[PDB]
């Protein structure tokens, strides 16, 4: 599948970059492919928790 | 809606 | 941490 | 050594006395209050671009432009054939309820309602037309005439 | 924790 | 201010 | 009995304000073409 | 008949348009073909009550 | 049918854009094809409550 | 008519 | 939320 | 919640 | 003759 | 609404 | 309600 | 001010 | 101040 | 009992500070290339 | 202010 | 030495 | 020791 | 998370 | 019991100047070569 | 204030 990493995050919107090079932006509630729907954005730790239990972090290389 | 810096454990 | 966030979030969305 | 502790807690509560809670709370109350002083009363006017037929025969009723407080409404003056009609001159009565801009060549008179509801009037002497196109304007209507195509009864300098 | 409308709702006690 | 924000 | 006096005077200053809103009629302006 | 809708309305005059493009303005008591005679003009709501029971209101696509 | 998503919303009016690309605008009470007529325009939530149950909200991509 | 900002649950 | 709003608007339209 | 005319009408208690 | 802004139900 | 308006109107027209 | 004569004429109680 | 607004 | 204005 | 009013003066003096920082909206700038 | 920072 | 800092780290990460 | 959350987390006693 | 210069042995 | 308020006053004098320095950011420079 | 400095 395609793994998305965090590109940047602030309270509310979060910009995200993946393995295909596509960039997206996400709020509190959005349908994000594969992981389902985003349960919350934790900005001060740089975390996205989604409905499918998958957790989006800054990539190991860019953090 | 959540202001996370307004966080308290 | 995060569990406080879910608790507060659901308590907000439960009370208008 | 505990004096440093209670004292420094006192400093954390007076130097930066807005808790990270209270900062976001203040910011959101500002947001709500400025939404409150930003929200127009009731249903705002309808921004609509219309087109009227201007009849200059005696007994005919003058065309009406409906305005909005602080909004541009540009009147364009049109002959019978579908061509523009440049302006010869214009007169505006009560110019503190309406503010007019116009480049001295074109056929576009752009008006703002300088105040909410007092109605007034514009005379527009056209290039080839002896009779002034003399129109009524009322601001604060439940619609706003964004622009109106005045299809005037005559034939302009462009065929 | 405080939302944007003005009302304050908070979680009670939650640790991770 | 509602809960469905 | 003094409440009458204070509301009167208050609105008297209001009403003179409204009336010399009425008397002002600004001159119309004529702009000419080029 | 001929259906009318308002374009402008103030205390007193009601500036009205027909379906044929004929344009007219009205006062407290005046004759309107088809709709009878005007009885009341509520400019705050944008309604005109006529004698024939017909109520003149802003047309749907301009209100 | 045709699906309209919120394009902009303020207390009172709201500009609405459909899947055919057409742009229209709605008030407290006005006719919307397919959805009947409107009862509520919640500008703070960006929700439009109409007759036959549909609630109009900002497009998932535009929100 | 309705101003939602003056809203109370 | 919206239920308070619609109750309020119907009670407005009922009381001119 | 208030209309444009001036008079205050408000719903009593309504949660969602 | 009637100014409805002086309206009172 | 309009009932008060037309009642006041007819009262004014009836009383000179 | 006040007329153009300056003398006040008002309806008593009318609802719609 | 009326309720038909 | 007349009743047929 | 008066500690609330003392911190009242302090908390307002800070809150007005944050809000008129908030009303600050600078103008945008342009640099036209050679 | 959380512990998983 | 390092044990103090590491213990503080684990006790911070254990208490949210 | 103090964290970045602003709350204080210190070890008790550790030496090397 | 540790600012060790605020360290105490 | 005066010790706490005295030392806190010394703390205000220190911490205010500290936060004022940390608020300071200076503008970078650009040196165009010959 | 460390000792392995």
Automatic annotation (TrEMBL), chains A, H, I:
Organism encoding this protein: Legionella pneumophila subsp. pneumophila (strain Philadelphia 1 / ATCC 33152 / DSM 7513)
Domain of life: Bacteria
Protein name: IcmG (DotF)
Residue window of the full protein shown: 207 to 269 of 269
Alphabetical keyword list: Coiled coil, Membrane, Transmembrane, Transmembrane helix
Gene name, Swiss-Prot/TrEMBL: icmG
UniProtKB/TrEMBL annotation, chain D:
The keyword Signal belongs to this UniProt entry's keyword annotation: yes
Source organism of this protein record: Legionella pneumophila subsp. pneumophila (strain Philadelphia 1 / ATCC 33152 / DSM 7513)
Gene (name only): icmK
Protein name: IcmK (DotH)
Residue range from the parent sequence: 105 to 263 of 361
Keywords for this protein: Signal
UniProtKB/TrEMBL annotation, chains G, R, W:
Coiled coil: none
Compartments reported by the entry: Membrane
Family, similarity comment: Belongs to the TrbI/VirB10 family.
Official protein name in the record: IcmE (DotG)
Organism of this sequence: Legionella pneumophila subsp. pneumophila (strain Philadelphia 1 / ATCC 33152 / DSM 7513)
Residues of the full protein shown: 791 to 824 of 1048
């Amino acid at each position: 599948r395609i793994i998305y990493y965090i590109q940047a995050v602030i309270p509310g919107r979060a910009w995200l970059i993946g393995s295909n090079g596509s960039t997206l932006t996400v709020r509190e509630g959005s349908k994000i492919p594969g992981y389902g729907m985003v349960k919350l954005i934790d900005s001060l730790q740089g975390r996205i928790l989604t409905s499918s239990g998958q957790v989006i972090k800054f990539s190991q290389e860019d953090s | 809606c959540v202001s996370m810096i307004g966080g308290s454990r | 941490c995060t569990d406080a966030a879910l608790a507060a979030l659901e308590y907000h969305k439960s009370n208008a | 050594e505990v004096i440093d502790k209670k004292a420094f807690k006192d400093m954390t509560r007076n130097l930066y006395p807005l808790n990270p809670e209270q900062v976001v709370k203040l910011k959101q109350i500002y947001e709500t209050s400025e939404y409150a002083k930003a929200a127009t009363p009731g249903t705002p006017p309808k921004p609509t671009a219309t087109s009227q037929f201007v009849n200059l025969s005696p007994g005919s009723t003058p065309p009406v432009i409906r305005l909005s407080q602080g909004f541009v409404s540009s009147l364009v003056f049109l002959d019978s054939t579908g061509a523009p009609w440049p302006i010869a001159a214009y007169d505006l009565g009560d110019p503190s309820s309406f503010n007019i801009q116009w480049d001295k060549t074109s056929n576009t008179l752009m008006i703002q309602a300088t105040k909410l509801y007092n109605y007034g009037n514009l005379a527009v002497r056209l290039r080839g037309l002896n009779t002034p196109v003399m129109l009524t304007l009322i601001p604060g209507q439940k619609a706003v005439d964004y622009r109106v195509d005045l299809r005037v009864q005559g034939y302009g300098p462009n065929a | 924790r405080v939302s944007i409308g003005g009302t304050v709702y908070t979680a009670k006690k939650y640790d991770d | 201010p509602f809960g469905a924000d | 009995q003094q409440e009458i006096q204070q509301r009167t005077s208050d609105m008297l200053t209001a009403a003179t304000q409204l009336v010399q809103d009425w008397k002002q009629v600004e001159t119309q302006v004529y702009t000419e073409g080029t």
